[PDB]
Amino acid sequence: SLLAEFPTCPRDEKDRPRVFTAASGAWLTDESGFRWIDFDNARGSILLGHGDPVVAEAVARAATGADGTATGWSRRVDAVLERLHALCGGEVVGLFRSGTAAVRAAVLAVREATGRPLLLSAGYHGYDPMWYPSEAPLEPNADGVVDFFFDLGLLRELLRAPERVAAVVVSPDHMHLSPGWYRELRRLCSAAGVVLVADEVKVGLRYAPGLSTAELLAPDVWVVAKGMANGHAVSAVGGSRRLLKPLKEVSFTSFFEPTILAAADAALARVATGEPQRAVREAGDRFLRHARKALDDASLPVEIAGDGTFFQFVPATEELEEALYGAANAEGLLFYAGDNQGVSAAFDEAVLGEAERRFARVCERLAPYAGGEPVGDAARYRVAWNVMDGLRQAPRDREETTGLLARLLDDLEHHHHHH
Amino acid sequence: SLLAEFPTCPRDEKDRPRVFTAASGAWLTDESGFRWIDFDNARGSILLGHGDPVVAEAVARAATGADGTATGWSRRVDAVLERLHALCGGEVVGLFRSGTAAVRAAVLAVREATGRPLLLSAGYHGYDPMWYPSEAPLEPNADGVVDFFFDLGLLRELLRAPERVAAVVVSPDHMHLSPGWYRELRRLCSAAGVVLVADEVKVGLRYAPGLSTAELLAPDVWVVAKGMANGHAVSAVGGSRRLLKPLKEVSFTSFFEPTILAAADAALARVATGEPQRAVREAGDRFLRHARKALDDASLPVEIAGDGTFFQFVPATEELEEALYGAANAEGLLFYAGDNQGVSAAFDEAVLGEAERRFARVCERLAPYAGGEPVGDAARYRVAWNVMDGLRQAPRDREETTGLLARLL
Numbered sequence: 001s002l003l004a005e006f007p008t009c010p011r012d013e014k015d016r017p018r019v020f021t022a023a024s025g026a027w028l029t030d031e032s033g034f035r036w037i038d039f040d041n042a043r044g045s046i047l048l049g050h051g052d053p054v055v056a057e058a059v060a061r062a063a064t065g066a067d068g069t070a071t072g073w074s075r076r077v078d079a080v081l082e083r084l085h086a087l088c089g090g091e092v093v094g095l096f097r098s099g100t101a102a103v104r105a106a107v108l109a110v111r112e113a114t115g116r117p118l119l120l121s122a123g124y125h126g127y128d129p130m131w132y133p134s135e136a137p138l139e140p141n142a143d144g145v146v147d148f149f150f151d152l153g154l155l156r157e158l159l160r161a162p163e164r165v166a167a168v169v170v171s172p173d174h175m176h177l178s179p180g181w182y183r184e185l186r187r188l189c190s191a192a193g194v195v196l197v198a199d200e201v202k203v204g205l206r207y208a209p210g211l212s213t214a215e216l217l218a219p220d221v222w223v224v225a226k227g228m229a230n231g232h233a234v235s236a237v238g239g240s241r242r243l244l245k246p247l248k249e250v251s252f253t254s255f256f257e258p259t260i261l262a263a264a265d266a267a268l269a270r271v272a273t274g275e276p277q278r279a280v281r282e283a284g285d286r287f288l289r290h291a292r293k294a295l296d297d298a299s300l301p302v303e304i305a306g307d308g309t310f311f312q313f314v315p316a317t318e319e320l321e322e323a324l325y326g327a328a329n330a331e332g333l334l335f336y337a338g339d340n341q342g343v344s345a346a347f348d349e350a351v352l353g354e355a356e357r358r359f360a361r362v363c364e365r366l367a368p369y370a371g372g373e374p375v376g377d378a379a380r381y382r383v384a385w386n387v388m389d390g391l392r393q394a395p396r397d398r399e400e401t402t403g404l405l406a407r408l409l410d411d412l413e414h415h416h417h418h419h
Numbered sequence: 420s421l422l423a424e425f426p427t428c429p430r431d432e433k434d435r436p437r438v439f440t441a442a443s444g445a446w447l448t449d450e451s452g453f454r455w456i457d458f459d460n461a462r463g464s465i466l467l468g469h470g471d472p473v474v475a476e477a478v479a480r481a482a483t484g485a486d487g488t489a490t491g492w493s494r495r496v497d498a499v500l501e502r503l504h505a506l507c508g509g510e511v512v513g514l515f516r517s518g519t520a521a522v523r524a525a526v527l528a529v530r531e532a533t534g535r536p537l538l539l540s541a542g543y544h545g546y547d548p549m550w551y552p553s554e555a556p557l558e559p560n561a562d563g564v565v566d567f568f569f570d571l572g573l574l575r576e577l578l579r580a581p582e583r584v585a586a587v588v589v590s591p592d593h594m595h596l597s598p599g600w601y602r603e604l605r606r607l608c609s610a611a612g613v614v615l616v617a618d619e620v621k622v623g624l625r626y627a628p629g630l631s632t633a634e635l636l637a638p639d640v641w642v643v644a645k646g647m648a649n650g651h652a653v654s655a656v657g658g659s660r661r662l663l664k665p666l667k668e669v670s671f672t673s674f675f676e677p678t679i680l681a682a683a684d685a686a687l688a689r690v691a692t693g694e695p696q697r698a699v700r701e702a703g704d705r706f707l708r709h710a711r712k713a714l715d716d717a718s719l720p721v722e723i724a725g726d727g728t729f730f731q732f733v734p735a736t737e738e739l740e741e742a743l744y745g746a747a748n749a750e751g752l753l754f755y756a757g758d759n760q761g762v763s764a765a766f767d768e769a770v771l772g773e774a775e776r777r778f779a780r781v782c783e784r785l786a787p788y789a790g791g792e793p794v795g796d797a798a799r800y801r802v803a804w805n806v807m808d809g810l811r812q813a814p815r816d817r818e819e820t821t822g823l824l825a826r827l828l
């Protein structure tokens with residue numbers, strides 16, 4: 001009861017946080033001694049594995065003072081900046097202490113540099129009150145943000161009068177939006193003459209050694225975080241000197257803290273090769289071939305969206321979704337409940353074999369659900385909203401859009417989110 | 420050229436950042452190999468010393484996974500929250516990733532909980548644009564903040580309409596404001612029925628094992644940061660459940676990152692004894708006895724405000740200020756230029772002897788300024804503004820305040 005916040009974390013059947021006492025690679029141990037295989041991985045910020053030895057040794061050494069001081073500049077600051085700039089492009093780069101801080105700073109900078117008041121947004125951008133929803137949909141909230149819920153129909157309407165729009169700010173999802181969705185967003189922004197900000201806090205550096213939307217969107221400004229430091233407390237923005245000039249006003253006390261620079265430098269050295277990203281895609285795709293087969297062989301109506309990099313279970317009903325995570329928890333498979341699963345590079349052959357055996361047993365426990373009505377679009381929309389906070393791509397008419405927004409938002413009114 | 424930000428850090432004569440390759444206790448080594456005694460200490464966030472061995476082992480252990488995972492809860496979370504609650508009081512505690520994030524979340528929470536639009540501010544609260552200057556003084560900025568510059572006269576004017584005030588939010592300075600200033604602030608807040616938020620990011624946990632203003636202000640909500648983790652990336656807010664209920668909407672990805680929790684737990688354990696704060700006060704005070712005598716024997720018009728916990732040089736002119744830091748730089752004494760000096764618990768007898776010897780040499784280098792015109796009030800206001808972003812305490816009538824604000828802005 002001391003904690004004033006409500007952090008997203010694995011929680012047990014009583015909604016209490018699970019207490020983990022140790023972690024190594026893919027494996028967590030809880031306070032009771034039970035071993036879990038981690039598909040959550042701090043919401044996909046642990047690309048390399050828990051307690052990765054090279055990152056951990058870099059951090060341990062930096063904690064001694066041997067790599068510099070929080071007092072000021074070290075050559076590792078250059079190393080991190082240079083690596084980011086090489087991977088993600090743009091002219092300048094800034095460093096921040098959370099994704100939330102970075103996206104807020106990025107969009108305010110664009111608002112300042114363009115002199116325009118409105119932000120058109122799709123997806124989650126962090127906990128800051130600036131993103132809190134408006135009273136009426138398609139109306140600006142109190143901080144000048146209009147949420148379009150990934151609907152490019154709605155976006156086209158908003159961009160008819162584009163002169164007040166400072167930027168379109170989008171958190172990509174590559175499970176629920178196709179490449180062509182991104183092409184259309186880009187050309188809607190081009191036609192309107194508006195700035196495009198890619199919030200790649202989650203997806204940046206994970207699909208490839210750069211932005212996931214580098215070619216698809218060629219954003220004017222980008223943000224990354226989860227992929228840059230194997231979980232350590234850093235994020236980054238980059239893009240044009242002109243658009244980001246207002247960032248010259250940013251400074252914070254811990255900027256030079258050397259453990260965080262150490263972890264970023266070490267993780268980004270791995271990220272730059274593209275190897276962990278490939279390892280993760282391959283491991284997760286292996287797990288998926290198996291899980292899809294096991295669900296099909298057991299007649300369970302659960303689809304899987306996405307791929308090895310990030311995948312999501314899409315069960316036909318909420319009661320089956322509940323029973324799925326209950327069963328997984330019983331078997332020590334730690335999924336990020338309802339959201340996307342993001343394996344790490346520590347998912348080696350032995351880990352995969354065990355996760356496959358555990359998943360087979362999950363499917364055995366789910367026997368009562370065999371033969372149920374298959375997955376319908378209503379379920380696909382509800383489950384996708386739980387990862388992207390807006391609408392998956394599918395054909396619909398404007399009235400279907402309105403109805404889905406109304407239903408999806410109403411049903412989340414009195415539930416905690418899991419950002 | 421790549422860096423979009425302009426970070427505060429030690430910079431050379433061309434304003435280029437100084438590059439430090441190693442650090443241990445009180446000592447830094449720069450890229451040229453020159454060894455410096457650090458009075459800056461990450462702007463006063465290094466209470467214990469660089470590479471403190473106990474913190475270092477706690478961090479190393481946590482880096483391996485042996486204390487848990489960034490995936491979720493660990494008993495170290497409970498440890499940190501319990502220690503903060505014991506030290507600072509209140510009902511609830513939240514953790515954040517910078518002082519800036521913590522103060523913003525705290526004040527927005529209070530605005531939501533009270534349903535009142537205005538924040539009356541004195542001092543620096545972080546880099547966020549919510550704190551940017553209004554287009555005209557005593558007027559709200561675009562985010563509903565009215566800066567009163569630590570003038571209690573101006574605060575009184577602003578509190579005549581207290582229905583619109585969510586909170587008064589103050590960053591203490593104990594060099595330039597007396598205990599009486601705090602008592603009067605407390606009195607005025609209570610009379611108006613307005614919430615008082617102590618932004619103790621800098622001063623929290625450093626003067627004592629608790630809030631610097633626990634007794635003077637008894638704030639409804641507090642924020643600390645620089646004192647809690649020997650420089651690691653964490654800050655904390657606490658106070659009443661009611662006022663901070665809106666923090667229930669806060670979550671962030673790296674919340675459970677184990678190295679930061681480890682550093683906080685270890686630093687807070689030491690903070691709780693009161694030993695490092697005493698060691699810092701004593702070491703600083705000794706250094707100050709020496710520095711004051713040296714400046715006086717050299718006939719140098721430089722006063723020193725504050726005490727061993729945080730002190731500031733107040734030179735008579737900007738020319739002499741610049742010459743003072745130039746000379747300190749040549750002798751390997753790294754001061755936080757123009758701001759407050761914050762020694763660490765690593766300032767032992769050997770560091771102190773060497774610092775004393777170096778500062779004596781500084782005073783020799785400054786012999787050209789001997790006998791210069793003494794420090795005046797305009798200098799005192801200017802230098803104090805550099806540390807507190809408002810007005811040092813001194814008797815003023817409204818027109819003197821108005822004119823100082825115009826001159827200093």
Ligand SMILES: Cc1ncc(COP(=O)(O)O)c(CN)c1O
Nearest residue numbers: 099100125126171201202671672
């Ligand atoms: C797309 C996006 N943007 C911003 C954020 C916020 O990042 P943080 O949790 O580090 O504040 C997140 C993390 N939920 C994210 O997924």
Ligand SMILES: Cc1ncc(COP(=O)(O)O)c(CN)c1O
Nearest residue numbers: 252253517518519544545590620
């Ligand atoms: C009183 C006060 N409040 C807030 C902040 C911002 O803290 P941070 O630099 O960690 O963002 C500072 C930084 N010195 C401060 O001194």
